[PDB]
């Protein structure tokens, strides 16, 4: 059973009752009990459990080789639920360039509840060892990160977390379960913004979490039931549907990524290119060892803000919009759209130059995507 | 513009673009920008704002005579967002019989983040004054409460909160905006489990929050955007649709409540009856002064567990299930279904006797509901 | 079991499998077979049967006291399926002012297939007897009709159809199953544009058909399966949901209809008023004998086109739009919007004057609807 | 702009108003008019036109290089609408093995309306010329057909229809617009059961029609508006969403088809194999000239009914169910499931042997699909 087959037949996404080959949408809040406390099929109140949500939870658990899945109303709701495993006075280590919304949730919400946050350059895992405090309880890493696609060694991070008694978490959004499986590498919890590649069609906001740890799963179920950031049934259905084509979409994206990077590296109007497939990229070898494919997110430098805006206007098949992982190729300028509150000198210092462009490669024809971006770069 | 008209024409629930007389369902995660940072209609990412969610938020703000509305993935997500207005070391006063999920969220989740919780018998508002600590920052009250329907003076609670610098919150689920408007009485924040009467059809899990305070609204928007417990667009649509009939449903429920209470008070197999419309009920006068109708939740005592189970089996039109506010009349036994973890002696002490039955009156014919419950009581 | 109870508990609208108190939405096209030809629950292909569609079909059959229900993609699809019971050379009698879309389907589509159409003033049922040809096979009547609300004797029409071997059909859209049940009066087939009152929320286009005749049901199932105008599962779900409040909505509409008619009859800027509740209305006695309530459609004359347009602009709570049976009160001018292709002299002859206004009364507050229309009429 | 790009960016599938990158779902029946007859965006009643339906209609018109698209409640509703272009006494030529539902609609429904049907072996187009009567008005062909995948020359059929004044129609379901474009070859009307490959996820029943002929489009719009077999907005949305991955899905299906056919041709338990890619298949050259890929439907003979049933039970990744074009590979036995009413001698004569198996290849991993079917065949 290869990956493309598991996407179709893994998890429980049919109706045992009627035989319907797709998961029914249980647009319902509560369930008849035949006797007090006797549930016909284990359902009693949809916040606690809903059969359509249970379907998408079984899918993500199967795809990540876990035991328990959890579906949340957004990626950041999944992150907040996982952070809530901790208590006031606990410390969490994160990669220093973690997603802006993650950094914001931790530094502007959870620090008010006494969670301490240290961000660390995890591209060298001994940086994690140094940052571990007596109060550290969690290690949270994305790999590759946004927008410069820094790679962190997942297996080494798992071993460090195990040795020091930490809950290890990987935000696996950019790679998806099709290419990278952190639970197989010893990580405790894997999570996703399903808003991106998993849904795949820019039409669901959702978060997904998987684990093989029965005790962490019990704690996550309790947090989900008590703080209530649950995914609804229609969105759960669209997630299950979108995941069916995950393998085909990711493979098309990867073919285009390879050709687009060739073009960018050869083009005179492009300076540095950031992507883990590039052999001079930091921890390229580490990425190849923990993943069998690539994210569709690429960043590259043109000269300045004026060039970046002109590039966007000159393209036919790159769409200016937020998010990533659509069927459409998306284009953005981090310095103006996601890092604009950071002072310009600090942006430059971090590599977020005025001309840094981020593209999220979609499923359009590969030659069209290469040719379109090249001709637009030619106008610079 | 009387209440039934406001339910139809209040808020923005049409499409300015096409003229569609219902709110379009924006099953979408992101939005084209014509230039970087220029949003066509103010939308850029659905977690931050979605037009269908904006519609239901405008409805609840209008119905509660507020300025800002917020839609969450569940009632307890709305509560958790409001609690997150506080910091570690802050103290919150709640009515002592607040909803089990609320008590659980505060005592098992937020206390781990250093929020201190005191529950207080708010039926005498001077009990609030005594409980105020130097660190108290929030007063959170339901009225009437579950399952014994205790009434708390909203206007007096608002004045106490204003005098002592507290954020006042009313959980207005049981009364709905059709009958009780806490913001008009000086409360800062009103919230609802829209899962119940507002949706009205047992098919959406959702929370709604309204306020007239610009600064609290800004803080709530930030929390919602950062912890991500947002309501999806399909559920937002069904909420808007369900609210259209809120007035008709509540008025039918109220006619049936009055007749059912007459029957229960006269029946020999029934002991005490709990409902704010009963003139000997504590704070009946207070309820009449802050509300112009009644909740459909009634509790009453039969002899024991055996009688309660027999009552349920003997009814034709009362459905054994969790939640309340359905179009169906629902029946439950709190001692077995919502308070079973409390020791029996403590249950008895609280009034949660083995024979305490809770009904949530639906919109069936009034004579059918009275006759059905009477004939079932006759079998005891 | 009174009507309001039957709307909640009649038909099968829960899930036997999970106990979900609402019908699951089976967004599915096909179903697993455990062995060739063995269907787990009788489903094999959604065009032939879908469980969500089966739910709404069971509702309409129960509400009309029939045995078989059928759900179509629109009211006119339900009509076309029923017309297709006939063969080339067959003749159908219809009331002379039948719905414009019905007249159009018969005279511009089915006459090309050799169905012969005679329209007849059925307010005198002996007009039907005279029109019966040797080739007549069907009698199709609406009562009350649009826009002048002509009433036809259903029971007498059923007896005539039985005596002459005709299939009798009543379009029961305007009255709904809450007020008028043609199958109980001997009619073979009853149908509805569920787009109007049954859905009730201006958000579904659908047709519903019910019958107690096993052989007609078999023929209708065959036509539905072969020409494929089936209602989808999401629309079927919204129909089931909307029907729950049918009784409450119709009763509110009826209270407002009575008061609005009082106002219109007293107002000097209004001439003739058309509604079956008016005691001088033709066949008022017949309507009272076959129905226990009223449609919310009222027509009345103001002076001219200029007055009609001014009336519409002056109202606050009457919405200019097509269709009827919304929660919003709707207003229209038939001479301009539904009868504009008829020459003006023929319109005048038929009673469709330039100043004829049609209102579809919604569920807004009764005093608001009366006061708003009166003050707008006062500006004339 | 290659095919994979056109699937993403062709047609209008964003919101001009908000910029939403997906088509909003207009769950609505009617639209505000600012003045009588003035439509804000051309919408007035959803049966006539709905913006979500308009989106999917623009997609199919673009994908088929037509000008007008039409969305129906099912494939057979699209066929029935196209047949209704004809009058009583008109004659239609169809390929002799056309889809069972098509044959049934014509011979059991439309013949009652005086449409005359001749079915003809169109694999030789001079068979069409011979069958043309003075009353012939339409030529309706599928290619390739079901279940033996007979190929008909589209371009020659178009020329014959033009010379003899016939409306030419191609049912393009099996090939999809990704591989075969009949309008480009001179055909007047192309239609699809979107229930199959276009939706692609076994969760929508729908039909789609496209044409470049303004006058035929006007007649189809009239028929659609009058007989009302329209696709709803939720199903229209899911169609637009499913079509995005059409190219990726079809290409994966085609890789698997090629390898599966190699295996079947080499296996001793398999006799004849039917698929247009096989070079000895009748009109293989014709197929290559009018299409640039293949259908995923393959039929092959095993020995008998017992072997066919054993094959099905022995597979892990082939699902026994009706329909085709799912993401799952589907398996069926025509003699038992689609041709069982035909007498056995006539079935054998037609090639529909007891051991004829039909598979619809899905998007599972190619090696898994080959290996699974081979090991199951090995058990025979
Ligand atoms: Na599965
Ligand atoms: Na582990
Ligand atoms: Na409004
Ligand atoms: Na205030
Ligand atoms: Na029922
Ligand atoms: Na009868
Ligand atoms: Na486009
Ligand atoms: Na042409």
């Amino acid at each position: 059973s290869n990956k493309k087959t598991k996407l179709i037949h893994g998890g429980h996404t049919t109706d045992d009752y009627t035989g319907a080959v797709t998961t029914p949408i249980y647009q319902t809040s509560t369930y008849l009990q035949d006797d007090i406390g006797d549930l016909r099929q284990g359902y009693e109140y949809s916040r606690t459990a809903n059969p359509t949500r249970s379907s998408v939870e079984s899918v993500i658990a199967t795809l990540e080789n876990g035991k328990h899945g959890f579906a949340f109303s957004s990626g950041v709701a999944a992150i907040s639920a996982v952070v809530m495993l901790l208590d006031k006075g606990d410390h969490i280590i994160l990669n220093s360039d973690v997603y802006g919304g993650t950094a914001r949730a931790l530094t502007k919400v959870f620090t008010r509840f006494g969670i301490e946050v240290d961000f660390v350059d995890t591209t060298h895992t001994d940086s994690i060892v140094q940052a571990i405090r007596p109060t550290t309880k969690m290690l949270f890493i994305e790999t590759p990160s946004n927008p410069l696609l820094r790679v962190t060694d997942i297996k080494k991070s798992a071993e460090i977390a195990k040795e020091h008694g930490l809950i290890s978490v990987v935000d696996n959004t950019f790679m998806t379960p099709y290419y990278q499986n952190p639970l197989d590498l010893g990580i405790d919890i894997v999570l996703h913004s399903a808003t991106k590649y998993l849904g795949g069609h820019s039409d669901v906001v959702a978060g997904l979490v998987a684990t093989s740890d029965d005790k962490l799963a019990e704690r996550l179920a309790f947090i989900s039931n008590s703080t209530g950031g649950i995914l609804g049934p229609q969105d759960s259905y669209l997630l299950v549907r979108g995941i069916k084509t995950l393998g085909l979409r990711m493979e098309q994206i990867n073919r285009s990524v390879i050709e687009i990077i060739k073009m960018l590296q050869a083009h005179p109007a492009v300076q540095q290119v950031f992507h883990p497939s590039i052999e001079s990229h930091l921890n390229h070898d580490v990425h190849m060892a923990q993943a069998d494919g690539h994210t569709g997110v690429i960043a590259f430098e043109v000269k300045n803000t004026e060039s970046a805006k002109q590039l966007i206007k000159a393209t036919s098949y790159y769409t200016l919009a937020e998010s990533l992982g659509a069927v459409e190729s998306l284009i953005s300028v981090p310095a103006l759209m996601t890092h604009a509150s950071i002072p310009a000198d600090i942006r430059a210092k971090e590599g977020i130059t005025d001309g840094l462009v981020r593209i999220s490669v979609g499923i359009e024809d590969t030659e069209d995507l290469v040719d379109d971006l090249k001709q637009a770069l030619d106008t610079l």
Side-chain angles (χ1 to χ4, degrees), chain A residues 353-368:
Chain A
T353 71
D354 282 355
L356 187 73
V357 173
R358 190 193 71 180
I359 51 166
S360 161
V361 173
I363 63 163
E364 298 98 332
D365 182 80
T366 293
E367 188 164 21
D368 283 342

Side-chain angles (χ1 to χ4, degrees), chain A residues 183 185-188 212-213:
Chain A
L183 302 185
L185 299 171
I187 295 293
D188 293 320
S212 300
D213 192 294

Side-chain angles (χ1 to χ4, degrees), chain A residues 26-87 89-154 156-161 163-214 216-302 304-339:
Chain A
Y26 285 88
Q27 196 66 66
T28 200
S29 70
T30 188
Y31 308 76
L32 310 146
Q33 302 179 28
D34 293 322
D35 297 276
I36 290 179
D38 291 359
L39 318 180
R40 309 193 164 160
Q41 292 295 329
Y43 294 95
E44 85 188 288
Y45 191 70
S46 278
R47 163 151 52 67
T48 311
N50 174 287
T52 310
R53 198 170 88 237
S54 292
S55 177
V56 75
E57 290 168 345
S58 87
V59 171
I60 194 57
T62 296
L63 293 187
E64 289 287 21
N65 295 323
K67 185 173 180 210
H68 308 280
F70 302 87
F72 295 89
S73 48
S74 63
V76 298
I79 291 159
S80 307
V82 167
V83 170
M84 282 186 149
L85 292 170
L86 304 182
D87 304 338
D90 286 355
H91 177 248
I92 175 176
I93 297 167
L94 301 99
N95 51 291
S96 56
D97 60 350
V98 73
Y99 169 65
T102 304
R104 170 182 72 241
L106 275 163
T107 62
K108 307 290 161 196
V109 180
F110 288 104
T111 56
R112 302 194 282 105
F113 306 132
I115 309 295
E116 310 273 41
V117 181
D118 273 285
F119 312 78
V120 152
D121 186 10
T122 53
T123 55
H124 199 313
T125 49
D126 277 352
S127 187
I128 301 163
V129 176
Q130 181 187 318
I132 286 169
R133 300 172 190 257
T135 52
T136 303
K137 296 291 171 165
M138 181 170 283
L139 171 63
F140 183 109
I141 61 164
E142 320 156 319
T143 177
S145 58
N146 182 69
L148 301 182
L149 298 149
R150 296 188 173 92
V151 170
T152 294
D153 191 322
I154 295 171
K156 284 191 190 187
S157 300
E159 287 169 14
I160 292 164
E163 172 65 21
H164 294 264
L166 315 185
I167 300 160
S168 50
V169 186
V170 168
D171 183 332
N172 198 33
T173 300
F174 273 30
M175 292 314 303
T176 84
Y178 192 72
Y179 286 137
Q180 185 169 267
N181 299 118
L183 302 185
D184 285 347
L185 299 171
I187 295 293
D188 293 320
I189 300 173
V190 65
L191 62 80
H192 297 263
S193 165
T195 309
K196 322 295 171 68
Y197 292 109
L198 284 165
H201 295 72
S202 311
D203 64 356
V204 173
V205 174
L208 291 175
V209 179
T211 187
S212 300
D213 192 294
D214 287 338
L216 291 176
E218 172 169 321
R219 290 165 63 185
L220 287 170
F222 186 88
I223 285 155
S224 173
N225 192 60
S226 303
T227 56
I230 56 148
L231 191 62
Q234 185 71 41
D235 293 301
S236 294
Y237 178 75
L238 290 164
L239 229 42
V240 167
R241 187 193 212 248
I243 288 165
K244 309 290 193 190
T245 52
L246 178 65
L248 304 190
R249 291 185 283 107
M250 293 313 284
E251 293 196 350
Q252 173 72 19
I253 288 161
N254 268 233
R255 297 188 284 270
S256 293
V257 160
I258 295 318
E259 300 310 308
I260 287 172
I261 287 176
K262 282 181 191 162
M263 186 275 292
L264 292 168
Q265 289 174 321
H267 201 283
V270 168
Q271 286 103 82
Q272 286 242 294
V273 181
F274 303 89
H275 192 265
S277 65
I278 297 166
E279 299 196 5
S280 59
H281 195 86
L282 165 65
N283 282 337
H284 164 90
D285 63 335
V286 167
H287 181 83
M288 299 283 99
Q290 67 194 14
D292 60 355
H294 288 295
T295 189
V297 176
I298 305 160
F300 58 93
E301 300 171 346
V302 298
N304 45 51
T305 299
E306 315 73 68
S307 306
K309 285 181 151 254
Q310 177 47 230
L311 188 61
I312 291 164
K313 304 233 143 215
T315 50
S316 291
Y317 306 131
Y318 294 76
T319 289
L320 174 64
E322 290 288 351
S323 198
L324 59 97
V327 294
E328 298 87 3
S329 290
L330 301 181
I331 187 154
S332 69
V333 185
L336 298 167
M337 287 167 69
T338 62
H339 297 59

